[PDB]
Design a binder for this molecule. Sequence first.
Ligand SMILES: CC(=O)N[C@@H]1[C@@H](O[C@H](C)C(=O)O)[C@H](O[C@@H]2O[C@H](CO)[C@@H](O)[C@H](O)[C@H]2NC(C)=O)[C@@H](CO)O[C@H]1O
Ligand SMILES: [Cl-]
Ligand SMILES: [Cl-]
Ligand SMILES: [Cl-]
Ligand SMILES: [Cl-]
Ligand SMILES: [Cl-]
Ligand SMILES: [Cl-]
Ligand SMILES: [Cl-]
Ligand SMILES: [Cl-]
Ligand SMILES: [Cl-]
Ligand SMILES: [Cl-]
Ligand SMILES: [Cl-]
Length: 223
Amino acid sequence: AAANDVNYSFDEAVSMQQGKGIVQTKEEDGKFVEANNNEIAKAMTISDMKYMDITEKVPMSESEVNQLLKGKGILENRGKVFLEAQEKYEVNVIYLVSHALVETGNGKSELAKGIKDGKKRYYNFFGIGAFDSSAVRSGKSYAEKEQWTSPDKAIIGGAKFIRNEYFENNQLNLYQMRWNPENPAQHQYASDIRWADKIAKLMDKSYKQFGIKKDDIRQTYYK
Ligand SMILES: CC(=O)N[C@@H]1[C@@H](O[C@H](C)C(=O)O)[C@H](O[C@@H]2O[C@H](CO)[C@@H](O)[C@H](O)[C@H]2NC(C)=O)[C@@H](CO)O[C@H]1O
Ligand SMILES: [Cl-]
Ligand SMILES: [Cl-]
Ligand SMILES: [Cl-]
Ligand SMILES: [Cl-]
Ligand SMILES: [Cl-]
Ligand SMILES: [Cl-]
Ligand SMILES: [Cl-]
Ligand SMILES: [Cl-]
Ligand SMILES: [Cl-]
Ligand SMILES: [Cl-]
Ligand SMILES: [Cl-]
């Protein structure tokens, strides 16, 4: 019956995002530092790729997706699998590619080449859970738990996670994934205050490259 997810005033949400121990980071002078309170408040202000529903699909062929992935390292020539993910889980493939490209350094980062454990290697292209050497051997790594033992398994698995844990939790766009205005400071995808902006920028370029129509835009989150 109750389908109202507007729960907090903006000032209430800001105070929550500024709460004790909550990690909020900003890229400065070549690396990540903790964001200050003013920066957090500014980052979460509403200004529109960041506000667009990414739980719908877009008309991109495997050829078009591989065009986007050309020259993208470990992600090059994996468009078939990104589209398997889109259709299986109803995840916007432009969003999915853009998120992967941000997180993996255009597919070229050292971490994108995975983490060794025994005879296997684990991959993670979406910043999901703990992903470093210690977590993998300790077994306390989501990528290991889900057995993302290849790049293709990491693409499909990443989409599954986003659908099941975010889209099914009513976090339908980048803003909601980052700032969870229905329940501020819980279940947020990333600590980088500009996480949504980085993904949205690549999304917008790809939308304009292929002439893709935008899905629903929502700008009301707060009382
Ligand atoms: C996708 C991912 O793993 N993101 C990290 C994020 O975890 C989210 C919430 C997730 O598992 O989907 C993580 O957020 C913290 O997660 C711990 C559980 O691991 C929670 O106890 C904290 O409440 C979370 N904080 C917030 C604000 O949601 C953050 C922590 O910086 O890192 C993300 O990369
Ligand atoms: Cl603190
Ligand atoms: Cl946190
Ligand atoms: Cl094609
Ligand atoms: Cl690197
Ligand atoms: Cl990420
Ligand atoms: Cl984990
Ligand atoms: Cl939540
Ligand atoms: Cl944002
Ligand atoms: Cl334009
Ligand atoms: Cl379209
Ligand atoms: Cl609002």
